[PDB]
Design a protein around this ligand. Structure first.
Ligand code: HEM
Ligand code: HEM
Ligand code: HEM
Ligand code: HEM
Ligand code: HEM
Ligand SMILES: CO/C=C(/C(=O)OC)c1ccccc1Oc1cc(Oc2ccccc2C#N)ncn1
Ligand SMILES: CO/C=C(/C(=O)OC)c1ccccc1Oc1cc(Oc2ccccc2C#N)ncn1
Ligand code: FES
Lengths: 241, 61, 147, 52, 75, 378, 378, 96, 75
């Protein structure tokens, strides 16, 4: 209950000083969010328009948006109606009430998935290991079947039932939906669902380093030039007779 | 090359502070094009295929 | 370097991705009958959708070419004579006019005073040009997106 | 006003004219580069790369 | 605030200086430089390092003792 | 005539940045004074562009910050620039104070004492600034620190509830902390101006602690170009953080919205408060905690009265040099302990480092200076 | 020795407020300089206590203001103190400028020109401050004024949409206007400090426009006690408004929340912008409107170059005295027209007063000064 | 707000209980109705802004908190608008 | 900035002054005061008032003409 285990470092295609995210892996991961988690896990901060030019085309993202009934605002009469989703709509929340998540899951609350690889220590490594490392409880410790067993979970008792098993839907790419490939793709997508700027910051970061590598010796040489008047100055003391 | 490249650069463009500023300004424009794109081209090689600009032809219409 | 940071701080004022995606909004072409006006928020400033009936279209094409401040026809101002899409703010200072119950064709501004017709061409009052009109394209006759 | 009207001042203006011309060029190219003013920048060969 | 000409009395001191355009910025950068940094490291390692090496030991032991305290071999 | 001297505005600029007589021999350790000014300006310019988009209510306090990083054009660049700039400001404050202590610069009584006021004010700013995102650490840091004011006899509970605007860190606390966070940096800048006024009276000290009047050089161009190079190095360190490691010096709990009913597993400050956070938990008493906590910074005001050496600087003082580095290592020990839980080895060595900090400043360093005098027959 | 003279901080206070040689004969018209400083401080102290409770989002922008006046302990007192203090600031700015014009004080080129910058900055502040309650007048005032920047050739539409953060006065506009409203008064205070720096160079002018060097008296206690009495009179006028007529100088539409689809019957500024609002609607052109609007204040910067008299003050100048009072009455005419609709008599006499304002400053007053010289054989 | 002004504490509690005010999240995840406490606002007849239009005339009845400060003349105007309700003069049809 | 002792050259001027504790604050407040205010009103009414009286007429007429413009006796 007190003792813990930390996740190892999986060699992500984006973790590395100048390494951009695998956009195909983000794309695959959106699908892994679309069927599996979205009916239990909220993503209140990401919209369909966010996906445009990243993992899907404009036409593709509009088509994915239309697939849900989003509650629109005041009509001409004074009541709330339902319409097909536009690009500007947020990802749909399964529970409108915070306590509605408790009674319709386990009693425990499933946290929002927008910002999760930045909200838990280890990042995507932890979420990958929590999914991947679902195992049977050791003797002496009774699991209690409202709380499943996971070693990576801080208290060793997690209310989440493992939703990562070989083949939960396929991809347009001829990719086998194995447990590891299912778990990697969500984690590579959740990186983007916490840090969209990722690719851009690595880009300007290279430009930062390449500029400083040109500017640092140059400003040094400017300072060294002006200071050479003092650095090579010679003193002589000539007191009277 | 008979008088140095630096010697002819001082004589023509670094003497007057006017042409010194002009050479910096004109040199800032031409540097921005060679750098922005040049550093973007380097960013292409370390992320070969990974970027949307490489994928683009997959989803067309 | 200085250009880039100065530009980035400048850009942090100009757009905001969530506001820029609300630039094009959807309205019903079946909700409104002939003559009536609808209230909907497009880009921030009110969008007016007027349906032009048979006893109104012929009146606009009759008023002469070199009469208004800037020479602009009624035939070139609309993609089709059946429907006219309008922006509900004046070209002078930007004020929402009281629709239908006007004088020279339907519209009148309660700010300073500007007389507009079925298309919205300035007849009386200190305004430089005609009423604002957006871009036009069609795919279905019952739904149009203001691009 | 009337005090600055004389042969010396005409000489003094003629002396600073190439300089004041070149500062105008610095200001212009400076403004053009800083705003990315497309109207002027469409004319220059290597900077041309912004194909719509 | 004081300005030059009002600072202090100095007598019989000649200062010879060179224009920055007559002299090189990095005279003997590595040849004179490398010996110098080693010299002033040597001059100070006995004053700077022994508190940090002491912290390192108090850090390395402390972390070790924290881990091996919760676990127990008998009941 | 030279207009730099005659003109009332330019006169100040000339006397402060151009013609100011500066010591020939001042270290890279003198650079942090200008770097702090860069950091205060950087914080004002990033802070304002954040304030153009930030919402001061508990509802969308967290959402506005998200809106900045996600939707606002280059908003993520400004946000991490501000968050890392605050840390940059703190690395500089510490080098600057340490330099002042090592080189005996504190003997400039007013300059230094205004600097103590300057340190407290930047601390008060950063503390209030952290509450603004309204994350788990933002709220729980606030509740764990404000609640200390309860321990003051008689005045206590009334003070906390006056700072709180109620009975806990709530709606009102987030709003007023923004107001105070907006005004404070300007009051800092004005005090930083008075700081420099007092410095120019004597001019700068130097690594030897001997007067530099015999070898003064003009601030321009020597310290103009040296401050440019130094600022280019501070931008390197700041932009290394913002553009490669934006989450390194920050706490992950701040990425989940505030929850007054759920306390996090660990309650830790950003690195710059960890040393002082350690001192607080080290002493079991409530009031003794805050009184040791205030004395943790307020001690710097006593340092001039605890100068015992015949020499100004530590340059020629080996006994004092060792006891100085002991202070830096001891503070690094307190930093380490601050970011660790309150269990077995950490409670003891935590309070061990805590008693050492105060013994080193109050008793140990004033003794070394006396012995060093005896050794020189002084 | 007297520590008022020697001590670096107290030295400034002594040279500015205590031992400063001041003219024996300066009118109650010299009081507004100190009163403006009181007003700037009053606005900072009331403004901050409002910022401790105010919300910067379109949702509860109006509700927070309500929360202040209704729920916040004496919040109503602070709110009307701030709103009336802004008007008080404007009555003072106007007396001060008028005094400067009448008495020839503008011949202090830098002092005056810094004051022109000071006027624009207080104007820009109040304009942005009014948007904050997010009432009908707050929004509709904002839309009617910002939209003027569209009339600038080529740059136009791009500028408005950059200041707007979108395509109208929206969510973002309310937020950034608060940020800019928070920073500006501090930038004002710093410019007000530089204003005084330039004033102390020459000292004060006096009602005669002749030098007062032969009859200078120390600022303390004569102008200390005269500024105390003057401030007691400004508190009387401010507290008459706040505590008997809090809604007198304000517009009722600001008591209903903002509605971008519904334009109010009248669109009128607070009294302090009415004169300039009149000038704008008087000229039918879009660009000519803004160019006459900028020239409405920017003209004060030309006034020193349009001084033609051999004497400084208007004290001995009857032709100029009449043409001065004509300017005050003409501005009162423009004030009246600003708060009136654009129908029959008001369009003509509005633009009549508008052309007179510019003719009176640019042509009429510089002619009277020349004639007055001829009459004295000068 | 009424407490110690026009009613006692006991009186204002009794007036508050007379309405069904929609309270927040319960233990299950649904919104229930309870008797009103003192801290509750005065109950709004229309939860939607356009619901006031269809259930009155098409025209919107404005909020009554801030009305003698939101219309020129103040309370005199509201008194006169109520008091001075009269029959239309000839030439002008009222439209019912 | 200038201070006392550096302002200007003044010669042969005697100033006799009294302590504020020896003299009354309001010597002849109404007896000397009232005549004085009337005197300086009279000295300025011809320069201050005729623009305001002119505004008053342009205000009184303008307001009158605004009301009697919308109404009409014939159709
Ligand atoms: C997608 C397969 C998916 C992921 C990934 C995921 C992760 C996840 C985390 C990290 C938490 C808890 C945060 C923490 O680490 O402390 C968590 C919480 C719960 N989950 Fe989940 N979740 C995924 C999807 C699903 C699905 C499809 C369900 C329903 C079968 C589900 C259930 C829950 C529940 C319940 C919790 C709260 C219990 C708890 O951990 O305390 N998740 N999820
Ligand atoms: C608000 C952050 C601060 C700023 C902007 C600031 C500004 C500076 C500047 C510009 C200098 C001159 C350059 C230099 O010597 O470094 C300086 C020196 C000095 N400051 Fe600060 N400082 C601040 C924090 C502090 C603090 C916290 C202290 C003491 C607790 C301090 C005390 C001193 C002293 C004693 C010196 C003299 C150093 C010397 O020249 O020998 N300052 N300060
Ligand atoms: C003394 C200089 C300043 C310091 C040390 C400082 C410190 C901080 C800190 C530590 C944070 C929280 C970091 C984070 O979680 O991202 C913060 C955020 C904030 N600061 Fe400052 N700041 C300063 C200047 C200012 C100024 C002048 C403004 C107002 C113009 C300001 C407005 C903000 C706002 C709105 C936030 C919340 C947004 C955010 O968290 O990114 N800051 N600041
Ligand atoms: C931010 C509001 C302002 C403040 C706080 C301020 C401050 C003051 C102070 C304290 C004085 C000295 C006392 C006095 O003579 O009244 C003064 C005088 C002066 N100010 Fe301002 N002022 C401001 C606005 C202005 C403006 C708007 C102008 C010009 C457009 C102006 C130009 C002058 C001039 C010319 C004087 C010299 C008067 C004289 O002594 O003859 N000031 N100011
Ligand atoms: C240059 C001095 C200032 C002027 C002329 C000024 C002017 C104004 C004006 C005209 C209003 C709207 C009045 C109303 O409708 O009640 C306002 C409101 C406001 N001001 Fe200021 N103000 C100044 C100083 C400040 C400062 C320093 C702060 C920030 C500490 C501030 C924060 C506010 C806030 C939050 C409001 C909105 C609340 C309200 O309307 O009562 N003000 N101000
Ligand atoms: C609102 O909490 C803000 C924090 C913060 O900004 O940390 C860098 C914080 C976060 C977690 C836990 C506590 C926190 O606040 C603090 C505040 C604090 O204040 C001081 C700093 C230096 C010296 C004395 C004190 C005090 N009292 N000392 C330690 N932690
Ligand atoms: C957001 O609107 C704020 C207003 C305000 O604070 O009035 C005192 C306001 C209200 C209603 C109508 C317009 C309003 O704004 C303004 C702003 C304004 O700005 C100037 C003031 C003086 C001189 C030039 C200008 C300009 N441009 N001149 C006139 N009205
Ligand atoms: S904006 Fe419509 S007439 Fe003035």
């Amino acid at each position: 209950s007190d003792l813990e285990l930390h996740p190892p470092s999986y060699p992500w295609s984006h973790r590395g000083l100048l390494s951009s995210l695998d956009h195909t892996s983000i794309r695959r991961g959106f699908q892994v969010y679309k069927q599996v988690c979205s009916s239990c896990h909220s993503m209140d901060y990401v919209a369909y328009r966010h996906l445009v030019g990243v993992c899907y085309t404009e036409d593709e993202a509009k088509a994915l948006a239309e697939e849900v009934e989003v509650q629109d605002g005041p009509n001409e009469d004074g009541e709330m109606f339902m319409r097909p989703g536009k690009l500007s709509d947020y990802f749909p929340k399964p529970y409108p009430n915070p306590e509605a998540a408790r009674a319709a899951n386990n009693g425990a609350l499933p946290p929002d998935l927008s910002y999760i690889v930045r909200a838990r220590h280890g990042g995507e490594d932890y979420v990958f290991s929590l999914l991947t490392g679902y195992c049977e409880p050791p003797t002496g410790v009774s699991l209690r079947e409202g709380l499943y067993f996971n070693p990576y979970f801080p208290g060793q008792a997690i209310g989440m039932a493992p939703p990562i098993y070989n083949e939960v839907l396929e991809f347009d790419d001829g990719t086998p939906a194995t447990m590891s490939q299912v778990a990697k793709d969500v984690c590579t997508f959740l990186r983007w669902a916490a840090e969209p700027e990722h690719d851009h910051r690595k880009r300007m970061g290279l430009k930062m380093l390449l500029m400083m590598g040109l500017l640092l010796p140059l400003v040094y040489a400017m300072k060294r030039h002006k200071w050479s008047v003092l650095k090579s100055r010679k003193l002589a003391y000539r007191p009277p007779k | 090359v008979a008088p140095t490249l630096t010697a002819r650069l001082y004589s023509l463009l670094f003497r007057r502070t006017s042409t010194f500023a002009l050479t910096i300004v004109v040199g800032a424009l031409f540097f921005e094009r060679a750098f922005d794109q040049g550093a973007d081209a380097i960013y292409e090689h370390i992320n070969e295929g990974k970027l949307w600009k490489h994928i683009k032809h997959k989803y067309e219409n | 370097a200085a250009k880039n940071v100065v530009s980035q701080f400048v850009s942090s004022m100009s757009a905001s991705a969530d506001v820029l995606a609300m630039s094009k909004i959807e309205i019903k072409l079946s909700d409104i009958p002939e003559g009536k006006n609808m209230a909907f928020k497009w880009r921030g400033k009110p969008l007016f959708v007027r349906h032009r009936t048979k006893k109104e279209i012929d009146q606009e094409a009759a008023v002469e070419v070199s009469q208004l401040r800037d020479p602009q026809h009624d035939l070139e101002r609309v993609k089709k004579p059946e429907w006219v899409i309008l922006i509900g703010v004046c070209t002078h200072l930007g004020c929402v006019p009281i629709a239908n119950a006007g004088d020279f064709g339907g519209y009148y501004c309660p700010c300073h005073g500007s007389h507009y017709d079925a298309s919205g061409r300035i007849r009386k009052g200190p305004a430089p040009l005609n009423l604002e009109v957006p871009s036009y394209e069609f795919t279905s006759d019952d739904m149009v997106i203001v691009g | 006003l009337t005090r600055f009207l004389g042969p010396r001042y005409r000489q003094l203006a003629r002396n600073w004219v190439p300089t004041a011309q070149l500062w105008g060029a610095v200001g212009a190219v400076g403004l053009v580069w800083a705003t990315d003013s497309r109207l002027i920048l469409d004319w220059v060969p290597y900077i041309n790369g912004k194909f719509k | 605030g004081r300005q030059f000409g009002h600072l202090t009395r100095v007598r019989h001191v000649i200062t010879y200086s060179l224009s920055p355009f007559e002299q090189r910025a990095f005279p003997h950068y590595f040849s004179k430089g490398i010996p110098n940094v080693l010299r002033r490291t040597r001059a100070c390692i006995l004053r700077v390092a022994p508190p940090f090496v002491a912290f390192y030991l108090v850090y390395t032991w402390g972390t070790q003792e924290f881990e091996k305290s919760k676990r127990k071999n008998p009941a | 005539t030279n207009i730099r001297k005659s003109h009332p505005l330019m006169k100040i600029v000339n006397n402060a940045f151009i013609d100011l007589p500066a010591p020939s021999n001042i270290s890279s350790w003198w650079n942090f004074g200008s770097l702090l000014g860069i950091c205060l300006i950087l914080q004002i310019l990033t802070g304002l562009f954040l304030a153009m988009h930030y919402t001061s209510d508990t509802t969308t306090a967290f959402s506005s910050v998200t809106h900045i990083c996600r939707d606002v054009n280059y908003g993520w660049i400004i946000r991490y620039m501000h968050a890392n700039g605050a840390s940059m400001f703190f690395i500089c404050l510490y080098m600057h104070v340490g330099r002042g202590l090592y080189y005996g610069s504190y003997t400039f009584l007013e300059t230094w004492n205004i600097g103590v006021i300057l340190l407290l004010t930047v601390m008060a700013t950063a503390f209030m600034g952290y509450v603004l995102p309204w994350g788990q650490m933002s709220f729980w840091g606030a509740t764990v620190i404000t609640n200390l004011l309860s321990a003051i006899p008689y005045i206590g509970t009334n003070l906390v509830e006056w700072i709180w605007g109620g009975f806990s860190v709530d709606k009102a606390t987030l709003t007023r902390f923004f107001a105070f966070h907006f005004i404070l940096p300007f009051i800092i800048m004005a005090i930083a101006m008075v700081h420099l006024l007092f410095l120019h009276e004597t001019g700068s000290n130097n690594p030897t602690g001997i007067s530099s009047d015999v070898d003064k050089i003009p601030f321009h161009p020597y310290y103009t170009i040296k401050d440019i190079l130094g600022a280019l190095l501070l931008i390197l360190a700041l932009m290394l953080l913002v553009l490669f490691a934006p989450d390194l010096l920050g706490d992950p709990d701040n990425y989940t919205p505030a929850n007054p009913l759920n306390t996090p597993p660990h309650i830790k400050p950003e690195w710059y408060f960890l040393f002082a956070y350690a001192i607080l938990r080290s002493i079991p008493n409530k009031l003794g905690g805050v009184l040791a906590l205030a004395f943790s910074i307020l001690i710097l005001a006593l340092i001039p009265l605890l100068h015992t050496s015949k020499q100004r600087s530590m340059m020629f003082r080996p006994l004092s040099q060792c006891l100085f580095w002991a202070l830096v290592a001891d503070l690094l020990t307190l930093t380490w302990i601050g970011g660790q839980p309150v269990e077995h080895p950490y409670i003891t060595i935590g309070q061990l480092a805590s008693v050492l900090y105060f013994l080193l400043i109050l008793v140990l360093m004033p003794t070394a200076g006396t012995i060093e005098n005896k050794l020189l027959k002084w």
